[PDB]
Each structure stands twice: as structure tokens, then as C-alpha cells.
Amino acid sequence: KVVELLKQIQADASVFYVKVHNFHWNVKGMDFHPTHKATQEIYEQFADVFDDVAERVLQLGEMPYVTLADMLKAAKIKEESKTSFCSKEIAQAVLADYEYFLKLFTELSAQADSQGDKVSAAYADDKVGELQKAIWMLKSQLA
Amino acid sequence: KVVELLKQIQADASVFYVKVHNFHWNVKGMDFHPTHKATQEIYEQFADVFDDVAERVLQLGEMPYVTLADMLKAAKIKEESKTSFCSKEIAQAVLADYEYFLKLFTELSAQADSQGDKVSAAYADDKVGELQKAIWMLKSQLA
Amino acid sequence: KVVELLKQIQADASVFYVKVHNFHWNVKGMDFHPTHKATQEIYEQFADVFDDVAERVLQLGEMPYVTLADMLKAAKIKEESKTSFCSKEIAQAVLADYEYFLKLFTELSAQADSQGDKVSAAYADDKVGELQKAIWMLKSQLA
Amino acid sequence: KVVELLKQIQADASVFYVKVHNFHWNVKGMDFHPTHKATQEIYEQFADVFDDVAERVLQLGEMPYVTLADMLKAAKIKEESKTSFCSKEIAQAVLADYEYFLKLFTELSAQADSQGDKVSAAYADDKVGELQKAIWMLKSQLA
Amino acid sequence: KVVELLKQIQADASVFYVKVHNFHWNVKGMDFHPTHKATQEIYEQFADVFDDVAERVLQLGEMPYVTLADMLKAAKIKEESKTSFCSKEIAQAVLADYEYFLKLFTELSAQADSQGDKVSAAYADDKVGELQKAIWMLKSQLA
Amino acid sequence: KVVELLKQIQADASVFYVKVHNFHWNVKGMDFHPTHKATQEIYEQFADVFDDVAERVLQLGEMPYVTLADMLKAAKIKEESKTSFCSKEIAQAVLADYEYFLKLFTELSAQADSQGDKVSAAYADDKVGELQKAIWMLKSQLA
Amino acid sequence: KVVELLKQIQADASVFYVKVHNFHWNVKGMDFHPTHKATQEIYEQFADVFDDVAERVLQLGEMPYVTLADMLKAAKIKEESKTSFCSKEIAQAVLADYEYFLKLFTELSAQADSQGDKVSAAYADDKVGELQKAIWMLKSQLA
Amino acid sequence: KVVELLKQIQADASVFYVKVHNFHWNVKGMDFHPTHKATQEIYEQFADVFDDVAERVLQLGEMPYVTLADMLKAAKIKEESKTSFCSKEIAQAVLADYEYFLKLFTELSAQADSQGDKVSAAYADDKVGELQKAIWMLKSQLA
Amino acid sequence: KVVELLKQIQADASVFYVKVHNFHWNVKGMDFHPTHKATQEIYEQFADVFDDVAERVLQLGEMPYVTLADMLKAAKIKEESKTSFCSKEIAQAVLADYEYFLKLFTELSAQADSQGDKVSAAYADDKVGELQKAIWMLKSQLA
Amino acid sequence: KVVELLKQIQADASVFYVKVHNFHWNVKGMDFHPTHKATQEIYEQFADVFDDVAERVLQLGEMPYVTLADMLKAAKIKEESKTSFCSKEIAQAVLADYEYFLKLFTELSAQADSQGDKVSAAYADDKVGELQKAIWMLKSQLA
Amino acid sequence: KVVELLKQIQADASVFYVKVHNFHWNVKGMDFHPTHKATQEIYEQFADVFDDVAERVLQLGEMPYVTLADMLKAAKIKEESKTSFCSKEIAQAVLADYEYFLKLFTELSAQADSQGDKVSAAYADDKVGELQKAIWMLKSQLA
Amino acid sequence: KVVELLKQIQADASVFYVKVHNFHWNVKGMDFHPTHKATQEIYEQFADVFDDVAERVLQLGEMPYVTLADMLKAAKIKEESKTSFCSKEIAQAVLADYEYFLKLFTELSAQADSQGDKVSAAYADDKVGELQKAIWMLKSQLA
Ligand SMILES: [Fe+3]
Ligand SMILES: [Fe+3]
Ligand SMILES: [Fe+3]
Ligand SMILES: [Fe+3]
Ligand SMILES: [Fe+3]
Ligand SMILES: [Fe+3]
Ligand SMILES: [Fe+3]
Ligand SMILES: [Fe+3]
Ligand SMILES: [Fe+3]
Ligand SMILES: [Fe+3]
Ligand SMILES: [Fe+3]
Ligand SMILES: [Fe+3]
């Protein structure tokens, strides 16, 4: 269902938001500043995903998550408790999460288009395009 | 301790951040728009408290929270699971949490100044003043 | 026909454009300024719908309406002769016309896609999303 | 009467506003782009005259027209059913209507100064100068 | 005399300037923020009226008031000594003072044109229109 | 005739335009830079009356001057063949010419209002006001 | 395949990019400035098509063209060896090339949607809409 | 008491606010324009002190002055009834009043810090520093 | 001599400045607005050549012209007494004068480099380049 | 010949423009992002060189290349057929191409000054300096 | 005395200012560009420190250093006579000097508060926080 | 030698940079504020020559001065030990040093042109012109 897929993204966005803050704070090594800058941009864009996806559930007449307790249980992304990272561990860590979200937004688009919900479908397709490009930049950067 | 007071603000900030999104999404009534805008300014300003205090913990040579699991357990702020709000009851809920944060930052200033950490105290004093101004506006609006 | 749906939207837009000027001028009560501001943004956005929809008719090789007499006869939105309004009256009036526009744009999108006209469908899908969002906000404000 | 003249300008502006969209959409020939841009600048200026005179009627304590049906009966300016124009027709059509608006605004200034309504006369004199300038520019372009 | 009207407007501006600060500080109730923000706009506009009229007296060759003691003695606007207001009280008080200013500026325009001082008359006609627009909005807001 | 008054201003503007350049280039003494900056502002503003005044003559259906030979003959402003100036000499010179233009714009406004030419008169009343303010400031500076 | 259509657009874009520079340099006649300004915006837009289209090939895991030699052998758009043009046959030339790109992007969208590549299709639908708008405007100018 | 120091600053600010207007209007001599611009920025900055200090009293739970009658009787800054000044007397008058304000803000910082009111003390320390910078600059200019 | 050439450039600039105003006011035909706006930019750029050249003569330790009487007798550009122009004739008039200024500036550069005056030569070389670009564009539009 | 050197730079710029696109797309390794940004700006300055030199050829009365077939025949920059690069590789490749362009522009400057074509020499001297700065920075980066 | 400590900071600031220019010019290695940009911001911010401290000395009624000869003597920042550095080397040098400025600013704050000079202490505390944040970032980059 | 003249300019720029801060801090008298600001603009411009000139040495393959100890021994501009200046003394201190820099940049241009180093000569000629203009202004101000 379109709504249930939206709430999965919502719960995963809020966990990824914090996970990316940890990368932002605890990155080590010579390119500390560029990764410090980039991670901050990532969690700001997923703060926007967090809000948009939730408000879209509201426009569709349902209830998004409103507690971190429920978002933690619902989330399929794993929290990161370690507190020191080099730049390429973070690129690898973010790349895997991008591929999970890409699968998630690809399903939302296919499912919304089958229900004739082209608005939810259009939103997913733009995020699909944004992720495919970021993914290709990371696989090139880790090459 | 300065660090353990900062980490409390950190945990409560992240819970307050989500609670205010719920007010943002689920406010009803004639004053839907100003409340929808005010709440958004608030969670953007507490996203900044969340990051500032965490990095200040980092500059003092200790570790902040890096997982939502730890932040929920540490947060004294109560999550709000109900999902429909009148405007006045958002002003009251927000006023009460502001008074909790005000008490926390005032102790942070007193504790940091004890220890000669005037930087942490200066930061806390700014938020004390910002909270005192906002708390006084809410009291006038609810009067 | 895609063109007939576009031209219906054009005629209803031009009638809605004037009606909202009336709400803009004749709102009474303590919410005068917020309503006076919001109505003006509404008619400026429908001035743009009026113009976009007309030239899309021309890019498809047909003629849009060019006279007020033809648009008044074709419009299903009805004019408002009352010259004094309460603020919740205006929100209710605007909510109803939006749902009419939402249905008009959904049919334009569905019909345009069925003919392989993905450009017209894409334009309509943008307006469906904007109308779905505003309707949720208007329903929340009257709740 | 000042209000009668203002409400006459109101109706004729609404008719001219749509007529200039027709010129805007259906100009043909080599000077298409400059004419396409000039016509759009003209209907945006008359959207502003439309709102200004209507609001001026209200601050003088009376009611302007609020329906397109009422403005078409009051409008002295002919609607235009033709659907294709060369660039010199449009400059001729616009010049003819500008001279009509000039007489109308000159009468408003004279009547308003009779009644000691100097703010209404001042607004009218500003539009008289704007019309006298554009009229002189159109005569040079047609010379 | 033109300068006596300017100096009277000058004195009444200075008292109204402080009075509006009192409304700005002590408004209570749910419409706190819009009134808090409108009142500040108002007292900055009368700060500029205070300076404009004073400097115009100087261009006409006499002296404006230069002490608060004389401004209180000369003013006809009355000071507000209570320290708590709801939003509708403030609106009714500003409307009453605006109508007083509108007569002062209308008389200034009338007298200045009778003497051939068209510059002073034009300045007053500008303030007359601003008051007439603001008055209409307040009457609508209290309706 | 308003035209003959306008063209007189035209001729005097262009002569004063060059005279002010001489003050700009050849000011001596410690106030070099404020006077150097002020004279440039002055001649840029009179380049503007030069063009505005000619275009109005054209909108009234007559011809302005089109050669320096004709303007130099028509001009009453005297040219300055001295090539070195003290800062107060410049202030004195500008003040004398400003009172000449003020007389000219007052007579232009008086005459245009006699014939019902409110546009030309409104243009002149603004220049009367700008000169009265500038004249006052110059008198204070030389006082 | 989507990729081989994307790469075809890439090759034709680079030839069209240089062809429009030739028009940009060698247009003659009284309309020199607008077409000179117009062509520069066209080749700046196809530089952007050139880069967008190639990067999408990479996000799809393939290689775009990387040499001018390969793109020349692949482009179907004809090079222009003539070295002097009037304004109308530049418009006819751009109109003909726009209709070729339009078919290409329409094919690209149809193939992308067939395979479930909604991102590539969304990009193509944008270019289809922009070409349809420009084609309509070119036909009006050549009418 | 901190509020008693705040309310004294408020009363003296409003009196000083007007006195500087008198300096602004009636400065004579060669340095007219720099002093005119300087006094305007001084009185606009004390208008801001006036409002800040008053709002601080309200956040501390007390009432500031709300009438010019009370502020005149509380003020210690003497009003200036003279209407003509050279530039150097204005600098002397402003220098004397600045050291009076400096002593007031210094006492305010001392009392607020002794009572643990770090917020009002921080505000006072900022004005103390700004007054010291302005005091030093004025002493150099009068040297 | 460099000063000789600079003062000749000075005199011809001031006459051309007014001539281009005549073209600006008195162009007729369907290209009125492009020619109206283009001619204005020309005279604003020569107003600056006028000032640059005069100030450079001053830096070289001699005196520029300071009266229109002196510049009129020195100028070689001829004044234009006709008061009605077609677009093509304005272009040809401007092209002929541009080739004169180009000559003049090429002689200034060559002469300045002889005596080692690289600054004057560098300014001249920039004007040579700007005129060569403009001359080629004018020849293309006249082809 | 100045023109033959300009046309050579033109032909090499067009090949270098594409080569740098290949570097832009296919850079791999840790330093993916900065190189992706750097290569894109590089090709944007050479798009500007491409247009400037061609327009300078036209100002000299000769014809630039207008065909990709002729430019690749004339170009001496080797095309790059590889599709995978680390950042150091790209730096060494660009450095070699910069040193070639540097000899082209120094020879261009030397020839133009020989013939008295100081405009072409100054354009070349600016490009020589820009290349010398970038060459120094690349040698520093490869050190 | 706070003044000696301000003057020590002044002398070290000017020596640090030049040393950072040296790092700015002579960094080598694949990380030239980020370091070149970062060093330029450091020396511009220490130019601001150089000026603030000197002006703070003067407001305290003392004299700062005014010659490089005296500042070289007093400075404890060591000059660097090497002309080639890798990036890690520069970060080490900058981190060591930042801990020196941090110590230096901490004593300034403590001693200024001892004398009730809260203005000097507040300025120093701002610098302590800026240095603590930058030091944390440099330690992470060298980690 | 070009490099030898460049590093001489570098050393004198760094000494002049500090001397002008001394003028900036220790100016006294009524004309305090313009002089405080002009000196600030001057030392910021010589900070730019300091960096430009050092970087030009580097791209010519040499090392500039890198320590204040070396720059002090190379500088010919004398340091200033006095600590108080009137504005007329500063104006001629600056004029004398400007005449020195003018000679230095002039000889740099001549030497660089002798070596075919036209980039260094163009930069020097730009500084020669900027100095020639300022020297003309200071002489007029001291006249
Ligand atoms: Fe939101
Ligand atoms: Fe952060
Ligand atoms: Fe349009
Ligand atoms: Fe309105
Ligand atoms: Fe003022
Ligand atoms: Fe004009
Ligand atoms: Fe790209
Ligand atoms: Fe306030
Ligand atoms: Fe100038
Ligand atoms: Fe170009
Ligand atoms: Fe400073
Ligand atoms: Fe640099």
C-alpha cells in the first residue's frame, strides 16, 4: 500500500538522519572537512524527506508516525554506535543505505502508479533520480 | 558536570524536535497557518541546539549520544502520541517544555561558570535569554 | 479530448480569478489581514493557471477562449454577488472550488496519459499535488 | 461622481485585461517575441489598475463590481473575437484603447479635484502621465 | 498656517509613537504576534512622519518643537496609562487616532493648496491616502 | 506655454550639467572627496531632468532643443571658465543656480495647472520639493 | 534501448551546439541583436543537454561518446558550411532541428516507460514539453 | 534593582532620542551633512535601546514606563531647548551623554551579575562596549 | 600630444552625447523601443568617456575643457538639427561616428606608447576594442 | 598571421572542451568530487575562449571555423579515447594541454603587437596570465 | 594588565598573519586547492584580530604597537623560513599556534574579569570558543 | 630583474600595510572619521598587492619573501614610531609613499616589457594608473 511504504521511509529517514549526524561529528582523517560538509547536507535533505513523506500521508488521509519510539521499532535501518570513522567507511556506509532507500522509493513509485496516484508516483521518481545519481557518484568515488 | 548537562539537552532536544513536528502536522482550527509556521521555526532551531551541544561535548573531549535508542532512554521530555491539537494547547505544551529547557540551560550556565568554562556558559546564557523572551510571549498569548 | 478539459479549466479559472478578488476585498472580521494576503496569492496563481492552460491549447494546435462572454457561458464555477464575508466562509468557498479543480485536473491527467500526451499529464499532476496539499490545509483549518 | 468613474475603469480594465491576453497568445510574424513580452507586461499592469480602483471604491465607502457578469454590461470596451494578429494591428488596437483610458482617467482627476478628493485625483494623474507617455511611444512606432 | 498644522502633527506623532509602544508591549491574548508585529510597523511609520514634518517646517523657515516637554503640552492625542490590552481594544484605539490624523492631514492639504504650497499639499495627500487605506482596513477588521 | 518653460529648463540643465563637472574636477582643499562625490550626484540628477523635460515636450506634441548650439543660446545659466575652486565657492554657486531652477519649476507648475496640465505640474512640484530640501541644506551648510 | 537513444541525442547535441554558434556569429540584417542574443541561449541550453544526457548513460552503467570523432560519425544533424544568414532562415533551421530532437525525446520517453525507467522518461518528458513550447513559438514567428 | 536601572535607561533614552533629533535638524556649518547622517543613526539606535530595555522589564515580570509624562519626570538627561548648533558642540553634548549612559549600563551589569541575572548583564556588557568604542572615537575627534 | 588627443576626445564626446539624445527622442518606426533603449546606453557610456578623459588630462598636469562654448568650437562631430529618424539611418549615423572615435583612440594609444604613457595607452586600447566590437555588430545589422 | 593563430586556438579549444568533459564524467577515486567540479569550470572557460576568438576573427574581417569536421582536422590537441582516470592523471593531462595553449597565446600576443593589433595582444596577455597562474597551481599540486 | 595581554596577542597576530601567507603560497601536493583556500580565510580573520585588539588597547587609554620591529621582538609566534610544505605539516603548525592563542585568550578573559573589565573578557571568550572549535576540527583531521 | 622588483614591492607593501594601520588608529581632529575609513580602504588594497605580487613571483618560478625579518631588511619605506596624527600630516605621509610606489611600479613595467613579460607589465601599469589617480586627488586635497 502507498501509505505503508511512505511510513517505512519516514521511520528510516529519522534513523538515517541521526546516523548521518554521527558520521558528521566523528569523522577522522585528512579530508575531515569535505566529509564534514557533505554529511551535513545529507541529513538536511533527509530532514526534508522526513517532513514531505509524513505530510503526504496526511494528504492521503492517514496518520504518520509521531513518536521516536514507534519510528525506532518501525525502522529497518541499523543505528551506528561506533564513534570514529574514516572517510571511506562513511562513503561505503552511505552507499549501502542509499541503495536501500532507492529500492524503497522504486517500490513506492511502482505501487502508486498502479493505484493511479501519480502525485506520490512523481515524488518517488524524483527521489529515485536523485539517488541513482548520488549512487553512481559514490561507486565512482570508491572505485 | 558540564558534559552531562549538555548531553541531557541533546537527548531532550531530539525528542522535542519530533514532538514539535507532530504539532506542526496535526494542528487544527482557525489559526492553522501561523501555528504551522511557528512550529517549523522551532524544530529548525532545536535541530541547531541538537548539533551545537553535541559538538560542544566533542570540543570538551567527550562523546555525545549517537543513537536514538540512547536518546529516548535519556530524554526526560515525554513523547506525545495523540495526533490532533487545538492551537491553545500547543502553546501550553510548548510553554511547559520551554520552562524545562530554561531550567536546564540556567544550570548549565551556573555549572560552567563554576568550572571557569565561560564559553559553555556564554552559549547557555544566549539560550536562556532566547527562552525567557519566548516564554514571556507565550504567557501574554495565553493570558 | 485534452483540449476541452484545458479550455474548461481556462473558463473556470477566469471566473474563479474574479470571485477571489471579491473575497480579497470584502473579508470582514479579525482575520482580515491573513485572509486579505492569502486570497491575493490565490488569484495570482490562477492568473498563471489561466495563461499556462491557454498556450498549452495552442501548442496542441487548437484555440483557447479569448472573450469573457465565452468563458462565462462555459464556466461551471459560479460568481458571488454577496459583498461581505466571514473568514471561515471564504475558506469554505475556496475549499469547494479547489475540489472541483482537483477533479478537473485529475481527468486531464488521466485522459492525456491515455493518448500518450505525457506533457499535459505532467502539468496536470503538478496541479493535482498542489490542490491535494492546499485542500488538506484548508480542511485542517476548518476542522 | 468619483465612484462611478472608478467602477467604469474597473469594468473596462477587466475586459482589456483579457483582450490583451488574446493579443499575447495569437500574435504572428517576425516581431512575435517583443510583442509577446510587451503584451504580457500590459495585462499585468491592468491587473493592478483593476485591483487599485476597486479598493479605492471601498475606501470611499461604496461597492465595486464583484462579478464578471456585471463588468461585461458596464464595459464600454469591445471584446475581440478574432484569433490571429500581426504586430501592427495590436499596436493600433492598444493605442485606440489607451486614448479611451486617457479620457477616462482625465475625467476622474477633474471630478475628484471638484470634490476635494485629492488622493483619487493624484492616482488618476499618475495614470494619465503613464498613458500619455505610452501613447506617444505607440504613435512613434506607428509613424 | 501650514507650519502650525505641521507642528501639531509633529507633537501628536511623538505622543502616539510612545502610545503604540505600550500597545506593542502589553497586548495579551491569542492574537498576540500579529498585533505585536503590526504595532511596531505603526510606530516606525510615525517616527518617519515625526522627522518629515519637522524638517518641512525647517524648509519653510521656522522652528519645529525640539523638546518632549513642549510636545506633551502641544499634543491633543491622549496618553494611555493602563498596561494591559486585548487585540480589539488596540484596533479601536488606533482607528480613533487615525481618524484624528486624517483630519489634520486633510486640513494641511487644504490650507497648503490655498497658499500655493503644493509640495506640502502633496506630502499631506500621500499621508491622507495611507490613512484612508489603513482606516478602511481597520473598519473591516472590527466589522 | 508649458513647453517654452520646459525647453528653458532643458537648455539650463545641459549648461549646468557641464558647469557642475568643472566643480567636480577642480575642487581644491581638504573637503575634496565629499565635494567630488556630491557634484557627481548633482550632474547625474540634472542629466535626468534634461532627458525627462525633453520627453515631456515631445509628449505634448512639440519639439525640444536638439543641438548644443541652440541650448547654449537659450540658456540663462552662466558658464564657469575658472578652473580651480574652494569647497564653499562651489556650495555658493550651486545654491544660486538652485534658486533659479526653483523659480523656473514653480512657474512651470503654476502655468501647467492653469491649463489643466496636471502631469507636467506634478513633475514640477516634485522638483520644487527636491530643490527646497537641497536649498535648505545648503543654507544650513553655509550658515 | 534507452542508452542508445541517449547517446544519439548526445552526438546530435554536440553538432547542433556548434551549428548554433555559426548562426550566432554570422546572422546579418536589421534583426541582428535579438537572434544573436537568442542563439547564444540555445547553444547554452544544448551544452546542458549534452552533459545531462551523457551522465544518465553513466548512471545506467554504460559509456557515452568521449570523442568528437565518434560523435560526428553518429550525428544525423547536418553541419552548416555556409557563413552568412538572415534572421528568417536561422529560425527555419532551428525549427527543423527542434522537430528532429522532439521525435528523439518522444521515442526516448516511450522506450524508458516501457522498461520501467521512469527517471529517464521524466527527463525526456521535460525536454518534449520545452521543445513543443519553442516549436509553437517558432511557427508563430514564421507564419 | 535591575528593573529600576532598566527603567531609568528607558526614560533617559526617550529624552535623548528627541535631543538628537534636534541636533539632527539644526546643525549648521561646513560639516552639516556628516553630522546630519551621524545624528540620525544615533537616534535610531537609541530607539532600539528604548524598546529592548522596556521588553526586558516585562520578561523580568515588572512594568516599564508607558507614558511620556512619567519618562520626562524620571529622566536625568536634560532636554535641549536651543535650536542652532555647530558640529563641535554636538560632539561635546553627545560625548557627555554617552558617559552618563556608560555609567548606567556599567551599574546595570554589576547588579544583574550580583543577582545572577546573566542575561540582562550580557545585554548591558554589549552596550558598555559599544559606548566605550564610541566614546574613544569622540575623544579623538575632539582632541 | 596625449592631452591634445584627450581634449579632442572630450569635446567630441560631449557633442555626440547630445546627438545620441536626439536619436533617442526622435526615432520612428516599428523598431522604436530597441532603438530607444540602445541609444540611451550609448550616451551613458559616452558620458563616462567624457569624464574619464577629462580626469586623465588632469592627472597628466593640464586642464581639460570646462565650457560648452570651448567644446563646441573644438568639436569635429557635427550636430544634427533634423528631428525625425528611421532606425537604419540612426545605425549608419552611429557607425560613422564610431569609426571617427576609433581613429581618435588608436592615435591616442600609439602616441601614448611613444612617450611611455602606458596608462593612457591602456585606457585607449580598451576603447579601441570596445569600438571594434560595436563596429562589427553595426556592419552586420546594416548588411 | 593573427587570424591563423586565433583559428588554431579556436580549433584546439573545441577539442579540449570535449576532452575535459570526458575527464569530468569518468574520474575515479577518493578525490571524485573536487575534480568533478574543477573539470566542469575548466570546460566553461574554454567554451568562452571558443566564442571570443571566433568573434575576434570576425572583427578582423575574416572567417572562423564553423564546422566540427574542419576543427578536428585543424586541431592538434589529441583526443582522449580512454574512459577511466584517477585525479593525478587528469592533472598531468590538463597541465600538458595548458602549456600548449600558453605557447599559442604568447605567440598570438607577439604577432599582434608586431602588427600594432594591441586589442588582440591584450586579450592574449590576459589568457597568458590566467594560464601561468593555473600552471603554477597544477605544478604545485603535482609536486 | 589586560593591555599587555592584548598587545601580546597583537604582536603574535601580525607574525601569524605572515606565516599563514607562507603556508598559503607554498603548499604542495594533491591537496593544494583546499589548503590554499583555507589558509586565505585564516589570515583574513587574523587581520581582523590584529585590528580589534589594537583598538581595544586605545579604548583603554593605552598605545598598541605601531611598528613591525616592535612586533617581531614581542612575538612568541615563530616565523617559518621554509618554502615548501605538505598539507598535514600546515595543519600541525596551525594547530600548535591555535593552542597558543587559546591559552593567550584564556588568560585575557580571566584577568579582565578580575578587574571588572567584562567587555575585554566577552571579546576574549568569543575567541576562546572559536579557537576551541577550530582546534577540535584540526585534531580530528590529524587523527 | 622582474622578480627583484616584485619582492621589493612585496617588502615595502608589508611595511606600508602596518604604517597605515597606525594612521588608521591614531588620527585625531575633526576630520577623524573619513580619515579612519580611507586608511582602512588603503591598507586593504595593499594587503592585495602584497599577495598578488608574491604570487606573481611564484608563477615566474622564484620564491618571494616569507618572513617579516626578511621583509623588514629589504623594505625601503621607513617605519613610523609616532602615535598621533592630524589628518593633513597623514595625507602627505601617504602622498610621499605613493610617489615611491609609483616609481617602483613604473620601473617594473619597463623592465617586464623588456623581457617580453607583458602579464607583469599589465599588472604594474594597472597599479601605475591607480596610483596616478590617487596622487592627483591627494595633491588637490592638500592644495
Ligand atoms: Fe512542513
Ligand atoms: Fe555540525
Ligand atoms: Fe504567456
Ligand atoms: Fe489588494
Ligand atoms: Fe532626517
Ligand atoms: Fe529617455
Ligand atoms: Fe556535470
Ligand atoms: Fe519590540
Ligand atoms: Fe569623476
Ligand atoms: Fe558571442
Ligand atoms: Fe579599524
Ligand atoms: Fe592568494
Numbering used by the authors:
A (entry chain H), B (entry chain K), C (entry chain G), D (entry chain D), E (entry chain F), F (entry chain E), ...: 1 to 143
What do the authors of the reporting publication say about this deposited model?
Collectively, our data suggest that CAIP might be one of the bacterial factors that contribute to the pathogenesis of atherosclerosis associated to Hc infection and that preventing and eradicating the bacterial infection could reduce the incidence of atherosclerosis.
However, CAIP is very close to HP-NAP produced by H. pylori, as the two proteins have 79% of homology and 58% of identity. CAIP possesses a dodecameric structure similar to that of the other members of the Dps-like family, key factors involved in the protection of prokaryotic cells from oxidative damage, and in particular to that of HP-NAP, a major antigen produced by H. pylori, whose impact on the function of immune cells is well documented. However, the two proteins have an overall identity of 58% and possess a different charge distribution on the surface, which may account for their different properties.
